């Protein structure tokens, strides 16, 4: 599978931007463009050898872990650290076959009983996305946390918090230009902060926006979708034009 390497050690705005761009490049190899936005392929007839992308993450402590991303939805499905691989619960039997092709050289394979959706991971982390800080610091710590999970040195809450970090800084940044821009500024000013409600509302709406965009009549939605501005005010979206600057990838609906 395609591998993208990124290190938090000395990360800059440019190196993070190059990283997200390469992830987007690998995710959209099989995408087609609807209303100027690439649509990720759906799983039907998508060859197994093209189902996943690998993201290798290092930090200053010279620890590395490898995430596996699903090209149908950009989401993290599992990861490898050393001789151990951990996968989220697959949502059907076809996906369970799919993940047997990841990390086939590890001696120890484990599938969590739970999925990797935000509501679950926040239950396990003991905190909501609103109170989990993001940035180069949080990501570096998440890498260490993932690395030592096989070792027995990471507790479940810390592990779920690290997943929440990785998914937002990689999967959601790949999906949304706005969220990539937010991570760039954290790096630019060397600061960590939790995402705001507008980021969270946008993450929650990714599937619904994809539906409204792909079912639209040359841009115009059949019905409006409410989004949240960063200042907290809420606004209706009636057309794809407003979303083109914000959203980089869509999930298949057709």
């Amino acid at each position, epitope marked *: 599978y395609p591998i993208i390497n990124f290190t938090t050690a000395g990360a800059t705005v440019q190196s993070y931007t190059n990283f997200i761009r390469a992830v987007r490049g690998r995710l959209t190899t099989g995408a087609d463009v609807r209303h100027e936005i690439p649509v990720l392929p759906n799983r039907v007839g998508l060859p197994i050898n093209q189902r996943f992308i690998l993201v290798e993450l290092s930090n200053h402590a010279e620890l590395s872990v490898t995430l596996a991303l699903d090209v149908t939805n950009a989401y993290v499905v599992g990861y490898r650290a050393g001789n151990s691989a951990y996968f989220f619960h697959p949502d059907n039997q076809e996906d369970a076959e799919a993940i047997t092709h990841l990390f086939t050289d590890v001696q120890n394979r484990y599938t969590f009983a739970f999925g990797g959706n935000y509501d679950r991971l926040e239950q396990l982390a003991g905190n909501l996305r609103e109170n989990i800080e993001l940035g180069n610091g949080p990501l570096e710590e998440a890498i260490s946390a993932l690395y030592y999970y096989s070792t027995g040195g990471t507790q479940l809450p810390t592990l779920a918090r690290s997943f929440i970090i990785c998914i937002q800084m990689i999967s959601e940044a790949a999906r949304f*230009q706005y969220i990539e821009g937010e991570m*760039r500024t954290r790096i630019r000013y060397n600061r960590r902060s939790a995402p705001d409600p507008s980021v969270i509302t946008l993450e929650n709406s990714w599937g619904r926006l994809s539906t409204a965009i792909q079912e639209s009549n040359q841009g115009a939605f059949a019905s409006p979708i409410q*989004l949240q501005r*960063r200042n907290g005010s809420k606004f209706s*979206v009636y057309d794809v*034009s407003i979303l083109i600057p914000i959203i980089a990838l869509m999930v298949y609906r057709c």
Partner: nanobody
Amino acid sequence: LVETLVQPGGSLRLSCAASGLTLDYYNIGWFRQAPGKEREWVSSISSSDGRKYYVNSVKGRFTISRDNAKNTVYLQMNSLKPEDTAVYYCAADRDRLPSAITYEYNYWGQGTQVTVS
């Protein structure tokens, strides 16, 4: 201070420039604000392309462009309508592409009252 009249179907060009900013490496966006309303995104141009973005209601009427010779970004407005009356603002940012979702940008230009009669 807002700078501040056009006939319906008329033209107007606004300028985005600041002495300290190499705009050819910024994302530029334009917004407009009616008296009782919020600031509405109009159009953006990306730094790391020449890629231009428009709200549907100005497509074919407004054109955004960069003049790298004068380090300036322009919004050319044609076929203006009374409904386009508003204070117009440009914004610029090295990291964020201006959009409707946020107003947090490194640079906000002075407003210009545009009044179509």
